[PDB]
């Protein structure tokens, strides 16, 4: 039944509606609230080649 609800999924146009059905929940809410991406964080983070040397943020 594609037009009708089967299970929980219901499709109207391009939208899909699905029924829903402590510290971990809090940190999941923190993950949802976080908008920054780990690739862009890698862009910020630099790396040292040796013990005492010029730290490079990105590869040349």
């Amino acid at each position: 039944a594609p037009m009708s609800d089967v299970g929980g999924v219901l499709m109207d146009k391009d939208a899909v509606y699905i029924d829903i059905g402590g510290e971990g929940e809090k940190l999941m809410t923190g993950l949802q609230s976080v908008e920054q991406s780990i690739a862009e964080k890698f862009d910020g983070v630099g790396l040292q080649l040796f013990s005492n040397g010029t730290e490079l943020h990105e590869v040349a």
Partner: peptide, 11 residues
């Protein structure tokens, strides 16, 4: 009840 999921998943 019915919660509209994020549009990124079906896309």
């Amino acid at each position: 009840a019915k919660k509209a999921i994020d549009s990124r998943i079906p896309s």
